[PDB]
Design a binder for this molecule. Structure first.
Ligand SMILES: Nc1ncnc2c1ncn2[C@@H]1O[C@H](COP(=O)(O)OP(=O)(O)OP(O)(O)=S)[C@@H](O)[C@H]1O
Ligand SMILES: Nc1ncnc2c1ncn2[C@@H]1O[C@H](COP(=O)(O)OP(=O)(O)OP(O)(O)=S)[C@@H](O)[C@H]1O
Ligand SMILES: Nc1ncnc2c1ncn2[C@@H]1O[C@H](COP(=O)(O)OP(=O)(O)O)[C@@H](O)[C@H]1O
Ligand SMILES: [Mg+2]
Ligand SMILES: [Mg+2]
Ligand SMILES: [Mg+2]
Ligand SMILES: [Zn+2]
Lengths: 637, 243, 97, 636
DNA sequence: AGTGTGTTTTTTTTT
DNA sequence: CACACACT
């Protein structure tokens, strides 16, 4: 332990070098204490970048990489003793004091030399801490691990704590032991096992896969499991891009028990710290940041009436025209209020729009633009997905051993904007399933043995081609699209895209494409091949942390969903009802009797229009704008 | 076993091998290799019979094709210099035109279109979320017995970055990528279909008309997006389709 | 291709046209049999090889076989005044190949 | 051999404080001591269990604070680990709370007979065998000033997601609905050993639920002279207890955004066993109890500590004089009141609203009181929001879906390696409420199965061949809507709808809703919605609502006195049926005797609802007015 | 007393 | 890995 003690001393010298860390720990402890007096207790997790401490000690920083299993254990021991000597509030929660709260070490930045990828991970670099960012398909459920056993015979007055770290949490590979709890203890003592004071760490077997696009053609994504034990439990859902900082470790004796003997070795990545980054193009994990500077920004424009049109223009800058369509998709993006009632009847604030368009009307790209604009962005085509699979798969999983719920899109759909393309081609069973589950925004999932009902409230855009190649006015719209009005009425907006062509507009489209094409991508050599590289992003973890820019716009609108919650206002109410007067009984045969749905649709549309204005309540301007756009869409103009 | 050997009426036997750290991952499946390794035997777990396999001491490519081109110029500066010279001489364009489809007797503009398609349209990635679609898919309509399938086969032989197939020969479900149940996992895994293989390659397929239309609809979307988006069976994997 | 429960994987099942390969191929009752099967035969014969990619089996088998189709005229009697295509209940492309 | 860390539990003082509390806790303190009252309950064995109440401990702590004694902070310690405290209570009721010492008539001496032989032929009698009970724990406070009056800090029930490994030691409370309930199974806690030559009766108690046979004898004379003493199973002397384990699903809203709901096992015994049903949403309380594995599971998968999580207390969620309801509904006139107040959001189809009220009670017939409501209605206007309202308010209310692949009586006998019966989707539907969703489009085989079930009030699972008939008369509601969304008034009143005529004719009553742009009622419904906005309660009218519990009592008295129909009613209904048949000859649907039977069922159901049989005539014009309004709605 | 040995229907996918 | 059987 002389080298162990030396590493403890060097880590202490580190803590001395960087006050901010001990300050952060101090802030953590006071956060723990006050919240304890009051919840949401953050764990004893401490985050120190690789680029940190790299300066004062090259040797220690290197040996962390070379032999993490010998560097981090003493480092965390020193972390813990420093914290408990510096928290200075030992008395409260004396029960948990004996159970002990380990202090955990995390990291920031990219190793590069160590941190490359799951596929690039090879045995040549093993027992060394690395980091990889990947998609996780499989997540194992949590199971506590009892490493410190609390057991005691009343007569002894000793309270034996037999602590066992067999395979996972241990780094020294301590010998396996069963923790029998001998009922004789040592001196024939009953040795009652005292529940509580006993450490339990909820274990996770989480396997992470590489990018399909980073994987070369014909190569399946490379998958490797990671372990999380009541320290990093459950930030991430399956199928999310996530960066994990883990050490490459082997277990199972490599399978070389006695003889077959050519079987592979059992290895696995145990990850101390994890940085989830599932945002597209390595963004902010779909979590838009916020600053008071950005807060005060935009707002002054929101007072100006033209801001809504400016936002509409900003959308799909690669597309020409479709300004009303862009306004509609903007209204889509902003989320309406889910009105709740003291019964099973809960009003939906979700926005659902159906659109029919000729092939190559950019609507597919439009759906793609909505995708890359939305946070969740659950999108597919009519042939793209299996309806049951996307809604719910009630098949069992072999590792689980019993019947499992597997909602491909539905559970992914709820609490996020979702998309669907070519719904005419979609399986009719899926169509009738989505029918009335998107109206009620909830699915009973009572199919098969499992009957648990799970909510599915989300905003959906539909882009299905006409039955004929192009919409023919001579044919009825329902002749042009075979999709029944069932839940087709339950689309808050309906859109028809016809690729009719006029010299002025044709020139406009052509010039737009000409500008988009000759334009060399930002920077780069004019004669330079496309790179679309990995960006070699060193920043990992907290290191990663009139026209308007798009991601900035997305951050603003997300901030809006967070903040702006308008309520239906009386003058807006009167405008709405005055419209509805003739809207429900319009003499013109616009087809699709609007009924009671469209009243709620326009309510939501005016609410989101107020959200554009950032007003804490709706305004009649929102109501009349929504009515104007709705009549625009319904007339087909 | 030696696809050229064609043992008549014998199912092709297969043997297991092992590779070392400086031998592993050298070559991909579906590629022929001339191997030099010791004959090897181990017990699988039938009396005194043990698993036959090979421990390899040297790997050589029977197909002889180089590995995944990592831009390392085995053609070196010289061969690419004459390549540019051929590009410098505009007549060589018609040279490539005529050379394609031997014995076709003409159809030169058709061959020019084929050369242009195989040449690969440039995929431009806009600073916007959008991205200009590079590849295109050429449609072959006409009278039968006109070397059309012959020309397709020739073109695929010219460029093996993709694989020649046929509509009926390709599984209707998951043409781009089929979903199959793994023997040791009851979950239906994603098996790479033709356009997974065709991704990154110019692909020729036969009997488009004879193929059932409904799944061919699923092909146009995949080529349009240049990817393959699947959410079937609760699996939301999306794979690129650059073909 | 045949799913093999004993081995637990999909296995190749002997295509009779592969059995035809390397030898003569007899064909009978063909004018009455299934049309999709006829198109499959067209595909197979065009390249003298059968290419199959399904169930994880992407194999392609050479089919070198001299084939002889047996057919009955429409109603069993060919009408010489009638055009052959009208005397034939089958496709034009097959008679071309 | 094992390191030991010292903790300030002060367990013995906890035990003596517990004894002092039990002595000192009164009903007056709750308002003689309550716990010697519990002792005399034990003595005569009036109950089968004695259950510790935390509320009593709360009052004790309050008293000790008044006394100024710290009281060891008993509540916090028992919350942290009560299983050891449970053993302390067992010791106390064995050690310090006295022997019952009360004369009993009978039915307990049989074990006391086993108890009596212990002294002759001579700890020897297990404390659990000594006194028999099931000691549970019932929380002391919730949403009160306790726990510093701050958020959570125990007490507050949490879903499975909020449960953590650190929570294994401490007692917990949980929200949600139990997915399923296991059957009862005897649990052999302590086994009574009987040897052949010696006859000695030694008792060992197994807590691992896995029993290892002793195969030897501890009797001294069997040990000497090497006579083989084998202790055999004397079950009747040994203790048993019914065991039930139940998986509880966390609430959907409790589940995080886009997360798969998690269910955990809950194990019960004694009082609570057999007293639970899966369909209920239960807020139950219990210590957290991790489950030791059978063996070698830990070797392959690490510790992997799982739990069985026995619950000490159970509280099913909400599911007031009975006659007091009658006084209000007489003032309320619940017929009209319920019809409107039941769906204030709908604002329309008031005749349909009246009809649905009668569907709830349904009626009962000696020879069978089935309304057979079919709501073909209008698509995209109602019958989904209109639907499922009765599901929550009425128990056994099921919002079933005819199609949509939402689930139909899919029995799963092969649910486990062993063939154990498992109910399907339709068997869940029962007499309370059966709401069909997406009825118009649905599986034809399911259509035939449901038609046979409803016409027979029986369910046939087959498979093993057994006819497990659990269904009885049940109220049925149809979500069918006209095909294409636009019914044809001119032709095909029955054929414009996907449902077959035989299926249509099977229902006793059928109604049609139709949306028309003729009037400005759009604006009135708009006023209702613009109530629902900035008045997030209801469209304010004279609806006079009936609370579902009050509605439950209204249903309870809706089946009253079994009103025998008057023969004047009999003549009136036969004349009405004759007129209906004659008009049918004149249209699309000929009058059927079963239709007249359904009319009679309507009349008697309304009669026993609030009124009575008597001449019963007036109720018959009420029901037949409903019928003719339905017929006109079909005709329009 | 040697020493050995055992426990973790559905749903697409064909067609 | 490690604990009940069947002799060792
Ligand atoms: N212009 C041509 N020059 C040379 N050979 C030709 C020409 N047209 C047809 N052929 C020959 O005719 C054969 C018939 O074509 P195939 O390779 O069978 O495929 P294909 O032309 O697509 O016919 P289908 O449409 O599939 S029946 C070719 O293989 C050539 O050998
Ligand atoms: N009369 C009404 N009063 C209040 N809300 C109404 C009314 N009619 C329709 N709605 C609204 O529209 C929905 C009610 O229609 P539902 O009963 O859910 O559907 P449906 O009419 O059965 O539709 P299908 O599937 O086309 S038969 C809810 O979201 C209500 O808010
Ligand atoms: N108005 C437009 N401006 C720019 N590009 C357009 C426009 N309309 C169509 N396109 C182009 O059409 C192509 C195909 O569009 P796509 O999204 O597949 O069409 P659809 O609307 O039928 O789904 C894309 O390259 C897209 O940029
Ligand atoms: Mg499209
Ligand atoms: Mg061809
Ligand atoms: Mg409904
Ligand atoms: Zn004995």
């Amino acid at each position: 332990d002389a080298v162990f003690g030396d590493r403890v001393r060097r880590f202490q010298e580190f803590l001395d070098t960087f006050t901010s860390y001990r300050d952060s720990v101090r802030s953590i402890q006071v956060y723990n204490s006050n919240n304890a007096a009051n919840l949401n207790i953050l764990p004893h997790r401490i985050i120190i970048s690789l680029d940190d401490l790299r300066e004062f000690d090259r040797s220690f920083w290197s040996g962390i990489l070379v032999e993490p299993a010998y560097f981090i254990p003493p480092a965390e021991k020193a972390l813990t003793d420093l914290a408990d000597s510096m928290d200075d509030v030992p008395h409260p929660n004396a029960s948990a004091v004996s159970s002990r709260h380990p202090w955990k070490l995390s990291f920031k930045g990219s190793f590069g030399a160590h941190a490359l990828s799951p596929r690039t991970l090879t045995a040549q670099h093993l027992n060394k801490l690395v980091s990889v960012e990947g998609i996780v398909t499989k997540t194992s459920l949590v199971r506590p691990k009892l490493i410190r056993s609390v057991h005691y015979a009343a007569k002894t007055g000793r309270f034996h704590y037999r602590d066992y770290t067999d395979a996972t949490t241990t780094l020294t590979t301590r010998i396996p032991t069963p923790a029998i709890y001998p009922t004789e203890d040592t001196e024939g003592n009953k040795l009652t096992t005292e529940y509580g004071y006993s450490t339990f760490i909820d274990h996770q077997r989480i396997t992470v896969q590489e990018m399909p696009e980073m994987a070369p053609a014909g190569q399946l994504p490379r998958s490797i499991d990671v372990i999380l034990d009541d320290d990093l439990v459950d930030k991430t859902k399956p199928g999310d891009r996530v960066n994990v900082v883990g050490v490459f470790k082997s277990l199972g004796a490599g399978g070389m028990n006695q003889s077959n003997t050519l079987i592979g070795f059992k290895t696995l990545i145990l990850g101390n710290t994890v940085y989830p980054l599932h945002a597209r193009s390595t963004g902010v994990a779909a979590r838009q940041m916020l600053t008071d500077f950005d807060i005060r920004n935009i707002n002054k424009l929101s007072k100006k009436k033209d801001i809504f049109d400016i936002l509409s223009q900003s959308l799909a800058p690669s597309i020409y025209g479709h300004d009303h369509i862009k306004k509609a998709i903007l209204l889509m993006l902003m989320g309406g209020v889910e009105k709740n009632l003291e019964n099973g009847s809960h009003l939906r604030g979700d926005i659902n729009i159906l659109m029919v368009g000729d092939p190559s009307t950019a609507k597919s790209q439009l759906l793609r633009f909505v995708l890359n604009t939305a946070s969740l962005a659950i999108a597919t085509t009519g042939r793209g997905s299996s309806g049951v699979g996307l809604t719910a798969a009630v098949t069992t999983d072999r590792e689980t051993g019993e019947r499992r719920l597997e909602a491909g899109a539905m559970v992914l759909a709820d609490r996020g904007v979702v998309c669907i393309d070519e719904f005419d081609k979609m399986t009719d069973v899926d169509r009738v399933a989505i029918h009335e589950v998107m109206e009620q925004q909830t699915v009973t999932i009572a199919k098969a043995g499992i009957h648990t009902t799970l909510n599915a409230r989300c905003s959906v855009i539909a882009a299905a081609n006409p039955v004929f190649g192009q919409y023919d006015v001579n044919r009825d719209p329902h002749q042009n699209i075979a999709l029944p009005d069932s839940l087709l009425s339950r689309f808050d907006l309906l859109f028809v895209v016809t690729d009719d062509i006029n010299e002025i507009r044709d020139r406009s489209i052509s010039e737009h494409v000409l500008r988009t094409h000759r334009y060399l991508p930002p920077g780069y050599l004019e004669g330079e091949p496309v790179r679309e590289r990995l960006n070699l992003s060193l920043a990992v973890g907290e290191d990663a942390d009139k026209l308007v820019t798009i991601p900035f716009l997305r951050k603003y609108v997300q901030y809006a969903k967070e903040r702006v919650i308008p309520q239906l206002t009386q003058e807006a109410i009167n405008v709405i009802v005055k419209n509805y007067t003739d809207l429900r009984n319009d003499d013109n045969t616009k087809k699709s009797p609007i009924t009671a749905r469209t009243l709620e649709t326009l309510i939501r549309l005016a609410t989101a229009h107020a959200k554009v204005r950032l007003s804490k309540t709706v305004n009649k301007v929102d109501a009349k704008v929504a009515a104007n756009l709705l009549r625009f869409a319904l007339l087909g103009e | 076993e030696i696809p050229e050997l064609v043992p008549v009426g014998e199912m092709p036997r297969n043997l297991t091998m092992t590779c070392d750290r400086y031998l592993t991952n050298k070559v991909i499946p579906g590629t022929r290799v001339t191997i030099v390794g010791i004959y090897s035997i181990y017990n699988s777990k039938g009396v005194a019979i043990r698993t036959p396999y090979i421990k390899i001491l040297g790997i050589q490519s029977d197909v002889e094709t180089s590995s995944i081109w990592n831009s390392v110029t085995m053609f070196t500066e010289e061969e690419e210099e004459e390549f540019l010279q051929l590009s410098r001489n505009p007549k060589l364009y018609e040279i490539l035109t005529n050379s394609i489809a031997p014995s076709i007797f003409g159809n030169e503009d058709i061959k020019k279109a084929i050369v242009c398609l195989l040449m690969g349209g440039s995929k431009k990635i806009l600073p916007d979320g959008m991205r200009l679609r590079g590849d295109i898919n050429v449609l072959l309509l006409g009278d039968p017995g006109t070397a059309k399938s012959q020309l397709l086969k020739f073109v695929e032989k010219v460029s093996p970055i993709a694989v020649y197939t046929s509509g009926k020969g390709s599984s209707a479900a998951g043409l781009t990528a089929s979903v199959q149940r793994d023997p040791m996992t009851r979950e239906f895994y994603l098996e790479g279909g033709a356009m997974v293989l065709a991704d990154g390659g110019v692909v020729c397929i036969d009997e488009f008309d004879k193929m059932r239309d409904e799944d061919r609809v699923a092909i146009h979307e995949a080529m349009e997006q240049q990817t393959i988006s699947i959410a079937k069976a609760g699996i939301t994997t999306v794979l690129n389709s650059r073909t | 291709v045949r799913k093999d429960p004993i081995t637990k994987e999909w296995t190749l099942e002997g295509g009779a046209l592969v059995l035809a390969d390397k030898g003569v191929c007899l064909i009978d009752e063909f004018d009455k049999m299934n049309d999709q099967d006829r198109t499959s035969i067209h595909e197979a014969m065009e390249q003298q090889s059968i290419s199959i990619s399904k169930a994880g089996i992407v194999t392609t088998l050479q089919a070198r076989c001299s084939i002889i189709a047996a057919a009955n005229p429409n109603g069993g009697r060919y009408n010489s005044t009638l055009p052959l295509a009208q005397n034939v209940s089958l496709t034009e492309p097959i008679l071309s190949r | 051999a094992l390191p030991s860390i010292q903790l300030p539990v002060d367990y013995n003082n906890l035990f003596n404080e517990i004894t002092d509390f039990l002595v000192t806790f009164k009903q007056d303190t709750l308002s003689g001591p309550k716990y010697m009252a519990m002792l005399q309950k034990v003595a005569n064995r009036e109950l089968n269990s004695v259950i510790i109440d935390l509320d009593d401990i709360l009052q004790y702590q309050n008293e000790k604070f008044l006394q100024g004694t710290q009281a060891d902070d008993l509540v916090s310690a028992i919350q942290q680990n009560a299983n050891h405290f449970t053993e302390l209570f067992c010791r106390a009721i064995d050690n310090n709370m006295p022997l019952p010492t009360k004369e009993i008539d009978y039915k307990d001496d049989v074990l006391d007979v086993i108890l009596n032989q212990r002294r002759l032929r001579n700890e020897l009698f297990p404390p659990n065998l000594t006194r028999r009970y099931f000691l549970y724990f019932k929380p002391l406070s919730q949403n009160c000033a306790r726990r510093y009056r701050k958020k959570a800090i125990s007490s507050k029930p949490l879903s499975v997601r909020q449960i953590k490994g650190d929570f294994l030691g401490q007692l917990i409370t949980v929200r949600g609905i139990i997915t399923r309930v296991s059957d009862v199974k005897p649990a052999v806690e302590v086994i009574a050993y009987t040897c052949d030559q010696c006859g000695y009766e030694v008792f060992q108690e197994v807590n691992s639920r896995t029993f290892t046979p002793l195969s030897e004898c501890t009797s001294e004379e069997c040990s000497q002279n090497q006579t083989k003493g084998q202790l055999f199973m004397s079950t009747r002397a040994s203790k048993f207890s019914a065991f039930q384990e139940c998986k509880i699903q966390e609430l959907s809203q409790q589940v995080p955004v886009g997360h798969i709901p998690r269910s955990l096992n809950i194990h019960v015994n004694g009082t609570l066993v057999r007293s639970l049903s899966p369909g209920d949403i239960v807020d139950v309380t219990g210590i957290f109890l991790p489950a030791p594995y059978t063996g070698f599971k830990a070797l392959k998968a690490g510790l992997l500590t799982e739990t069985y999580l026995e619950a000490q207390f159970v509280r099913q969620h909400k599911k007031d004089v009975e006659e007091r309801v009658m006084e209000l509904i007489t003032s309320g006139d619940v017929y009209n009141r319920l019809a409107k107040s039941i769906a204030p959001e709908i604002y329309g189809n008031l005749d349909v609203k009246k009809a649905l009220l009668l569907l709830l009670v349904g009626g009962v017939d000696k020879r069978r009181g089935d309304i057979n409501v079919c709501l073909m209605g209008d698509p995209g206007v109602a019958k989904s929001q209109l639907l499922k309202a009765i599901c929550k308010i009425s128990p056994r209310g099921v919002y079933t879906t005819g199609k949509g692949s939402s689930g139909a009586a899919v029995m799963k006998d092969p649910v486990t390696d062993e063939m154990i019966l498992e109910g399907g989707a339709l068997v869940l539907a029962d007499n309370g409420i059966c709401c069909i969703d997406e009825f118009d489009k649905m599986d034809e085989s399911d259509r035939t199965a449901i038609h046979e079930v409803m016409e027979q009030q029986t369910i046939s699972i087959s498979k093993a061949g057994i006819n497990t008939t659990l269904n009885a008369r049940t109220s049925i509601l149809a979500a069918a809507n006209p095909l294409y969304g636009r019914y044809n008034p001119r032709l095909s009143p029955l054929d414009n709808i996907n449902l077959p005529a035989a299926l249509l004719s099977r229902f006793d009553i059928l109604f049609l809703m139709l949306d028309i742009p003729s009037r400005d009622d759009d604006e009135k419904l708009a006023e209702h919605v613009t109530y629902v906005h900035m008045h997030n309660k209801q469209p304010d009218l004279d609806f006079t609502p009936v609370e579902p519990s009050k509605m439950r009592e209204y249903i309870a008295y809706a089946k009253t006195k079994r009103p025998v129909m008057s023969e004047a009613v009999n003549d009136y209904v036969v004349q009405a049926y004759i007129r209906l048949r004659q008009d049918s000859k004149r249209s699309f649907g000929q009058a059927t005797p079963r239709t007249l039977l359904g009319i009679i069922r309507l009349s008697q159901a309304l009669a026993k609802l609030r009124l009575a049989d008597m001449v019963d005539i007036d109720d018959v014009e009420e029901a037949l007015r409903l019928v003719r309004v339905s017929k006109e709605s079909l005709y329009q």
